[PDB]
From Swiss-Prot, chains A, B:
Changing E196 to Q/D: Decrease in activity. The lineage of its organism: Eukaryota, Metazoa, Chordata, Craniata, Vertebrata. This is Acetylcholinesterase. It comes from Tetronarce californica (Pacific electric ray). Its EC number is 3.1.1.7. GO terms for cellular component: extracellular space; plasma membrane; side of membrane; synapse; synaptic cleft. GO terms for molecular function: acetylcholinesterase activity.
Amino acid sequence: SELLVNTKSGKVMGTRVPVLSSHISAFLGIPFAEPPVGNMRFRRPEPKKPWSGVWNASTYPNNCQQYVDEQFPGFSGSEMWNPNREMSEDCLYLNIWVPSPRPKSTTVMVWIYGGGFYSGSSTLDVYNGKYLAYTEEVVLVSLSYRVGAFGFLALHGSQEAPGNVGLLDQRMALQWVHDNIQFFGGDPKTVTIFGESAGGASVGMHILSPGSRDLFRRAILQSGSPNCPWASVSVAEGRRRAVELGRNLNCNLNSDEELIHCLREKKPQELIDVEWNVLPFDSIFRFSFVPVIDGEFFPTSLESMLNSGNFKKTQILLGVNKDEGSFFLLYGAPGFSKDSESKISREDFMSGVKLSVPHANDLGLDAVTLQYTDWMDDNNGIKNRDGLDDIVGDHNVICPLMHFVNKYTKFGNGTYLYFFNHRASNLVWPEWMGVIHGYEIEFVFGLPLVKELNYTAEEEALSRRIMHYWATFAKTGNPNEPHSQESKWPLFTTKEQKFIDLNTEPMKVHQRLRVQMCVFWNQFLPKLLNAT
Amino acid sequence: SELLVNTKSGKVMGTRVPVLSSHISAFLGIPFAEPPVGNMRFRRPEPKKPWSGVWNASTYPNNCQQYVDEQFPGFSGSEMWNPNREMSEDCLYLNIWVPSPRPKSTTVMVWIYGGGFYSGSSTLDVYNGKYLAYTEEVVLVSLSYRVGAFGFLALHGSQEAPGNVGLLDQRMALQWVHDNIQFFGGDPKTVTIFGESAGGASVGMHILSPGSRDLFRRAILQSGSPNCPWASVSVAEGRRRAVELGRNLNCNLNSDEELIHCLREKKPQELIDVEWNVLPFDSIFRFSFVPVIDGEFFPTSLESMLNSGNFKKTQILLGVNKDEGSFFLLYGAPGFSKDSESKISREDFMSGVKLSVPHANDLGLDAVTLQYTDWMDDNNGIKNRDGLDDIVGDHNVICPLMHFVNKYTKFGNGTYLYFFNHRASNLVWPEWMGVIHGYEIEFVFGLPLVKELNYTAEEEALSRRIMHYWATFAKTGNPNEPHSQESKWPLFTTKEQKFIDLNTEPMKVHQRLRVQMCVFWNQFLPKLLNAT
Ligand SMILES: CCC1=C[C@@H]2Cc3nc4cc(Cl)ccc4c(N)c3[C@H](C1)C2
Ligand SMILES: CCC1=C[C@@H]2Cc3nc4cc(Cl)ccc4c(N)c3[C@H](C1)C2
Ligand SMILES: *[C@@H]1O[C@H](CO)[C@@H](O)[C@H](O)[C@H]1NC(C)=O
Ligand SMILES: *[C@@H]1O[C@H](CO)[C@@H](O)[C@H](O)[C@H]1NC(C)=O
Ligand SMILES: *[C@@H]1O[C@H](CO)[C@@H](O)[C@H](O)[C@H]1NC(C)=O
Ligand SMILES: *[C@@H]1O[C@H](CO)[C@@H](O)[C@H](O)[C@H]1NC(C)=O
């Protein structure tokens, strides 16, 4: 049977699913680790014990325990990201979509969901892998990993809660794909990992970490980089936040052993209820439990690893969206609202800068303000709103990604960079937010091909072009079909630094993506904060 | 006789001079102070002892002792600024041009020449007052004052070389105009002082100094402000430079008395020969002997005087030229030449920034570089050259003037601001220099009306418009003729900050002159240098 597959862990039975007037196979909810429960909370994951009999893989698994967005009850724009299955600490599973008839040895793509390391699910409608598996004939895998305190509480030095276990969850799933994907028709030697937001930062972290490098061939990073300011903390800050978490739950703080034991007795929701109380500053785009520079998963600081070429050398495809910051401002900065144009007063602009660069002294805040203020028209509410949008986006996503791409390209074997700036015609979010953090995903997964979703014919064409770029890149290390007649996406080089836009217009090549602002964020400001 | 005038100091006999196919009277070289020679070198000036008989005022007086420009031997562009009469320490004289027939009580304009406080003459062709006196029917006066060490050597605390004596020379001439101009047909109650460069900074210094305020009615400042970074030094820096000067001349440095005595025995040229050796930094647009914040001529710091409204309140007319910096770069920055387009390499750009902001630490230099660099095209030699031109001009002339105008306007009775950007058609300097520091003067003095000088008809029209704005402002406190039909030069207000361009095109009103760069130079950079 096409739906029965014998793996090294046991047999699994999939289900046949319809997709664009055809069908493919889906193996949903396959376990790749022992449930990280009880005394296992906060610990490194354990390989799943093999099972006898047939594992029913016809339905989605539970989603990991996480903060749930209730800012706009009943609004699809936000609820489409919330867990759509029951939440449970028993959540370490993966899903595989396989072309029918089953391939023999074809290209594999493994998706790592984003969510600031505090949320995310592999079961979201926007992550349905059937369109991509079917359309590009690839075996599509989506893994899962612990988020929040469950995946990143870090008390360095202890082996009960070492930190980074969420990253090790991802690695175990990559190990399982390496060991078993051949039985589903996939080529374990041609696996591409790709992810968005924290998922994109994660991809970069597997490129850096010696322990993950051998488990994949190529990588794709969307709106996220390993070196992002929100993606990691020192072991000292991680410890401080773990202790403060315990303090919020009235735990004994005498020893790591005492703290961990207390935290392990709490119910999932008790930890989630006070999770946000441990941040050190009043800020936006900062999350409580994230990866830690431990000296193990990451041998040394991320910057020295990038400088020395201490990372996997291969081809990478990566990029960002036009208005990465709007989402965060809507949710956490004064003056921004879902139902108004959100024109910003000079007073709220100033409040916003402060929330955006939480780690800056007054001279630093003045430097940022001057860089983004048009002093010939300083009370223009639209410029203030858009200036703040760029500040958040440049500081948190674009400039860190540009620094990573320039450092990687020096030692890598091929880089392809994009700038996604198409605003979907059926977007439910207000116009002021523009091209939002996370909204290129639906085009990567081919949702515009589904007629009932209401995209335009041009949007379907764009989605097809993107899916083919991604899949062709996974298969060959180049998004372009060599002998084709279509416009070519040039290679990004240290010298020319070329990139392309991704929208419904005719391809256009540019150079030095937001270079002026990124020299400010990557060279000047850091130097100013260190001097002062 | 129209050419004989009885003043409180004695009788003077002028000469009749032709001007634009007509005639007026000129009284050249009238003494207003005792010769500041011998043991008087470095001392405050003394009123001229009255004389019996008739003082011959038919020819120009000597020019004060000064550094002479020999950078382009035989080139008119530079020699037109050099002393055109014999140099001598006996140089405290003034010149008066009087309409014929002699007025009874008409508007008076007193010109104060510029030259970085180290050079200048009242006898230059470009300062010939006959065109303005004749055309606008004003009594035009040009005074003189000591420059270099002779006018500004400062050993605070000593009464032999107190500092600021060059400014007191200007004041004595203003006192003489106040006391005697009535006899030449001028109204001592309607005297306007105007000057360019250090002359413009001087005008502002008389507005500030309690001891000078009562001696004039209104003021005009061209390309210079009292608060300019090159216009004054602290008493400590003044002292340090006076001692270093003595050190260059192998003087006894045991006491002020010993130093001054030695300096007084040296010949004028010995002091001029080592004058430039006392600057504290490798720089451009910095001069050795300038006014000192002494607590006497200037009661407190210039900034606190501006902030408290401690200054003469009246109307002022002032402005700047488009490319104030080109002159200084040509003469002192690597990569700039008179006979080439001077495209600047990134290496010379960096050298240039360093010479332009001599007082900056590395973080400050990086801030300036980022502010003026286009990172999408950083090796464009024309942008590097022009960026450097703006840096020198904004830092040294424009932004200091904009700060002064914004502080003055709060307490003043009327402000009119201009931006002169017309490049003369007969300019002998290369095109890359643009509209040069000092080249609006020829239009203020009406040289374009002289056919043989070869300006265009449009340039003659522009000169006439400027002469009429200046003279009408001196006469009424407003450059506009109220009931006229011509385009109106609006008042600069704290709120609207309007200004006009001065060129051959139809008047155009703008707002917030170089506001973006000036917030950088007046608020951010100073704050960065103080924090670091
Ligand atoms: C950084 C957090 C995060 C990042 C990814 C992109 C993302 N984008 C969102 C945009 C809006 Cl406006 C509202 C809700 C959103 C959301 N829950 C997500 C999720 C969560 C995935
Ligand atoms: C700051 C020194 C100074 C300022 C005023 C304007 C001025 N401008 C000059 C421009 C050039 Cl290119 C060459 C020579 C110039 C010169 N000796 C002067 C004199 C000297 C008067
Ligand atoms: C689990 O597999 C069985 C087949 O053995 C199927 O009938 C069932 O619907 C699947 N999912 C459920 C109901 O939990
Ligand atoms: C990638 O590596 C191959 C073989 O090692 C080399 O021939 C090729 O030029 C490289 N490509 C790039 C873009 O560096
Ligand atoms: C000085 O005045 C006399 C008239 O008394 C005149 O002849 C002479 O030319 C003037 N200047 C000179 C020659 O120095
Ligand atoms: C100048 O002062 C007069 C009288 O003191 C006043 O009426 C007038 O409004 C003032 N003009 C300005 C521009 O301040």
